[PDB]
Design a protein around this ligand. Structure first.
Ligand SMILES: [Zn+2]
Ligand SMILES: [Zn+2]
Lengths: 50, 121, 49, 105, 116, 50, 230, 179
């Protein structure tokens, strides 16, 4: 459909990027449908207790 | 750390202290009253000094004494910095160092009303 | 009990000393120390006492 | 205790008497008024009986009391035919009660 | 001294100072209106850098009925001659360096205030 | 670092009177722990000990 | 922080601040406006076209020229807006959703000056004469704190604090939980009048909104909904 | 530390009341209402402020504060929680009736005496034998609930004898006394 592909990849981008960084500035955090945001790969090793 | 003879006497160390601290006009000035005195010999005020020195708006600026002395300044240097900072676009007419009030007078010479306020700030 | 008297006398002399500093400043005779305002020379005399 | 009693006695009849009436093709009125509250009861296969706080504490219940309001529905349409089919005491929810308040057993 | 705001007479808006470039005088014209009224102060803006304020101008006389404010009987009033007077310090922010006291007569219909 | 500050309007507690710079009115505890502290200076001693 | 009395509208805070520095311009930081608007613009939006009349609301003694020359700098600032209508267009041009037509923008700046800012003084049809007095009092009290005639307020004074006990703590919940169930009986009247059938409310009243919102926040401690508990 | 606190033993947190019988009273004293006032008459007149709302102007604030206070000491129009603050230096009377204001009870002191006289102690010793209680001390006009924004204009004595006796004067204008 050469127009929906654009939205498909925009949402693919959102998912593949919040997999490795859940905190983005100005971007909705990927939450689980319990209501809690995810622990991306960057958070598994970010700060203290990484 | 003071060097020579200034290191001993508190008097000759005090003018070093004056030669290092930042004094602007606001520390020595007391009252700034702009005026539209048109004829410079007319002088809406009691001052016989202009009449010995000779734009219609001035800045009568009356200075302070116990602030002018505690830094030891004379009106010649204020008058000189006052035209060296703004060049020859102004004409300060200072008082003498005998009178009781320490009045300066500025006048422009060469949206004109607010300009004495703009340069007095 | 002689020490108690010595102490009560020192403390009363001190409360008395700060009253005179307060009088002096209330009548404008506490001249500022050169380097301090009035409320700082006052507070310094008081804390010294 | 005074803060809670004032919540129950005024602030609930104030939150609900000032929420605006909802409407929606013809449209209706649906107005709320005059709330009531009862004492904490349990089975209200069982029969409604008062829960005592120590029984509520031992069975891991929640010492609460159920709230009722009286809603007048006015659905009104063409031909100028409205009915205030008013629903008395409609259950709204259960409100938990502070022990040894004016509304505790 | 000072200059006040002097308001227009037609639109009751604020009059600006404006120099009359023909007769050599100082005017006050408006922006919304065309109202020219003739000045008299011949002073435009004044500025107290010392910010010299007299506190006796700010003292209201109503302070004397303040239960929480110390009372003397050693300074009597000068208009009436009452014995009671309240006294307080400048009570102002921006108190430069002064712990000077101010007195008010504690007698109704007098409210005379003075400084020693 | 200063004496007890004017927390009410121009006084340190409501017991004192406006503009009281004296020793007792600004925090100078003049008892000892053996005699015990007066009520106002119990409070000022607590403000200090906080 | 202006608030009315446990209204479904929360607290809404003005700010009549003064800039550091012409110098000495007073601004206003109204709610639901992103930028700030000089105050004389607000007094004209509230409807005072004259300049003396704004000033009688701000300065009660016209006899001390001390406070006159402090509000001149902001009185010169908005000499470009003089009637009410261009004044609303100034504020209305700044909202969160600025209206594409002018008339949308004046309908905005008239609605925020009657319900968003200073509600406690009144949210009626005509209350500008007492929102004007209470605004001029806020400016006046700012000018007293700048002229140094009055001491600044201490944030720690317990006279400036209120405690929320188990009463308001719960009436803050029971407002949101009572709005959620009017959003539920709404959709349930909707899916049901549009079939053209008739709708019943016994099944529209979702009882698990109160009974479980209370029991949830009183159980975890999070004072909100479960969907936004972080 | 310092963020979590605790009430003192006799603190009462006020639960809140409606400002409408106050607004109605003040109207029929000599107030002047804010919308029928000439802006030239706020200069020498105290501004009245019920619950944060500037509703009114009054030309005589030594009769309001004494009437408002008599009227709380009887528990009739003003309930006992309401607090009237009179700022002398700026001309403002502020009346709060809202909730959440923490307050505490203080004995009242009229000239230099307390109002708590030996009758009340004896009647109060014979409580639980009939029915005399704290509410009669409040209704009779002996104790008062003063709170923190109003506590800034009381002149409070700490013990009653010893601070209301006669020496070189400390204040001699006490207005309350602590229990
Ligand atoms: Zn005009
Ligand atoms: Zn007198």
């Amino acid at each position: 459909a050469a127009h929906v592909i654009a939205e498909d990849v925009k949402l693919l981008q959102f998912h593949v990027a919040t997999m490795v960084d859940n905190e983005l500035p100005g971007l909705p955090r990927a939450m689980q449908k319990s209501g809690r945001p995810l622990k991306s790969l960057k958070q598994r090793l970010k700060g203290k207790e990484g | 750390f003071l060097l020579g003879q200034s290191a001993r006497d508190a008097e000759r160390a005090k003018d070093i202290l004056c030669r290092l601290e930042h004094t602007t006009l606001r520390k020595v000035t007391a009252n700034t009253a702009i005026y539209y005195d048109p004829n410079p010999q007319s002088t809406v005020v009691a001052e016989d000094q202009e009449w010995v020195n000779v734009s219609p708006w001035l800045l009568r600026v009356e200075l302070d004494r116990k602030h002018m002395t505690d830094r030891k300044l004379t009106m010649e240097q204020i008058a000189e910095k006052i035209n060296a900072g703004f060049g020859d676009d102004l004409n300060c007419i200072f008082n003498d160092d005998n009178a009781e009030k320490l009045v300066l007078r500025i006048r422009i010479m060469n949206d004109d009303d607010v300009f004495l306020r703009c340069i007095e700030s | 009990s002689k020490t108690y008297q010595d102490i009560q006398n020192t403390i009363k002399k001190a409360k008395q000393d700060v009253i005179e500093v307060i009088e002096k400043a209330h009548n404008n005779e506490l001249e500022p120390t050169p380097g301090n305002t009035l409320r700082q020379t006052f507070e310094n005399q008081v804390n010294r006492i | 205790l005074d803060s809670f009693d004032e919540f129950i006695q005024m602030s609930v009849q104030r939150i609900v008497e000032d929420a605006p009436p909802i409407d929606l093709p013809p449209r209706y009125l649906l107005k709320f008024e005059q709330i009531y509250l009862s004492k904490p009861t349990h089975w209200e296969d069982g029969a409604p009986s008062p829960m005592m706080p120590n029984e509520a504490r031992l069975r891991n219940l929640t010492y609460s009391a159920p709230l009722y309001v009286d809603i007048t529905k006015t659905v009104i349409k063409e031909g100028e035919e409205q009915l205030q089919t008013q629903h008395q005491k409609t259950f709204i929810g259960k409100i938990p009660i502070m022990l040894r308040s004016t509304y505790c057993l | 001294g000072f200059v006040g705001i002097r308001f227009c007479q037609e639109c009751n808006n604020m009059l600006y100072p404006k120099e009359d470039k023909e007769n050599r005088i100082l005017l006050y014209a408006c922006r919304n209106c065309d109202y020219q009224q003739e000045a008299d102060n011949s002073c435009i803006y004044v500025n107290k850098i010392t910010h010299e304020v007299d506190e006796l101008t700010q003292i209201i006389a109503d302070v004397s009925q303040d239960p929480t404010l110390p009372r003397t009987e050693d300074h009597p009033c000068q208009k009436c001659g009452h014995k009671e007077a309240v006294f307080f310090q400048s009570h102002s922010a921006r108190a430069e360096d002064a712990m000077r006291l101010y007195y008010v007569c504690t007698a109704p219909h007098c409210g005379h205030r003075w400084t020693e | 670092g200063k004496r007890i500050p004017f927390g009410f309007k121009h006084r340190t507690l409501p017991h004192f009177i406006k503009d009281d710079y004296g020793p007792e009115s600004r925090g100078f505890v003049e008892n000892s722990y053996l005699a015990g502290l007066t009520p106002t200076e119990f409070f000022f001693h607590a403000m200090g000990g906080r | 922080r202006s608030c009315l009395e446990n209204s479904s509208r929360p607290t809404s805070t003005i700010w009549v601040s003064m800039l550091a520095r012409i110098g000495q311009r007073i601004v206003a930081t109204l709610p639901y406006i992103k930028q700030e608007v000089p105050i004389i613009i607000v007094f004209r939006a509230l409807g005072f076209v004259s300049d003396r009349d704004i000033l009688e609301h701000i300065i009660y003694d016209f006899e001390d020229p001390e406070m006159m020359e402090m509000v001149k700098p902001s009185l010169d600032e908005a000499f470009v807006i003089q009637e009410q209508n261009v004044a609303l267009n100034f504020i209305g041009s700044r909202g969160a959703k600025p209206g594409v037509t002018k008339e949308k923008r004046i309908k905005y700046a008239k609605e925020v000056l009657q319900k968003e800012m200073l509600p406690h003084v009144g949210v009626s049809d005509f209350c500008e004469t007492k929102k004007a007095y209470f605004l001029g009092y806020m400016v006046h009290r700012l000018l007293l704190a700048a002229l140094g005639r009055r001491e600044l307020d201490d944030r720690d004074h317990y006279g400036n604090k209120r405690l929320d006990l188990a009463g308001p703590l719960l009436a803050f919940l029971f407002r949101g939980m009572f709005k959620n169930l009017l959003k539920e009986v709404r959709i349930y009247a909707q899916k049901f009048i549009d079939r053209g059938k008739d709708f019943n409310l016994e099944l529209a009243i979702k009882t698990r909104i109160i009974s479980d919102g209370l029991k949830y926040s009183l159980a975890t401690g999070n004072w909100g909904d479960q969907k936004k508990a972080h | 530390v310092g963020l979590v606190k605790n009430l003192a033993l006799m603190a009462y947190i006020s639960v809140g009341s409606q400002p409408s019988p106050i607004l109605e009273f003040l109207e029929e004293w000599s107030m002047e209402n804010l919308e029928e006032i000439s802006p030239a008459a706020i200069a020498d007149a105290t501004k009245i402020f019920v619950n944060g709302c500037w509703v009114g102007i009054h030309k005589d604030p030594e009769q309001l504060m004494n009437t408002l206070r008599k009227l709380r000491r009887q528990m009739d129009i003003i309930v006992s929680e309401v607090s009237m603050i009179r700022d002398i230096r700026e001309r403002e009377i502020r009346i709060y009736t809202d909730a959440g204001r923490i307050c505490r009870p203080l004995l009242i002191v009229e000239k230099q005496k307390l109002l708590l006289k030996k009758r009340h102690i004896d009647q109060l010793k014979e409580r639980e034998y009939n029915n005399y209680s704290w509410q009669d001390l409040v209704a009779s006009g002996v104790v008062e609930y003063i709170d923190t924004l109003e506590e800034e204009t009381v002149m409070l004595a700490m013990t009653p004898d010893d601070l209301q006796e006669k020496e070189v004067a400390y204040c001699s204008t006490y207005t309350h006394c602590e229990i």
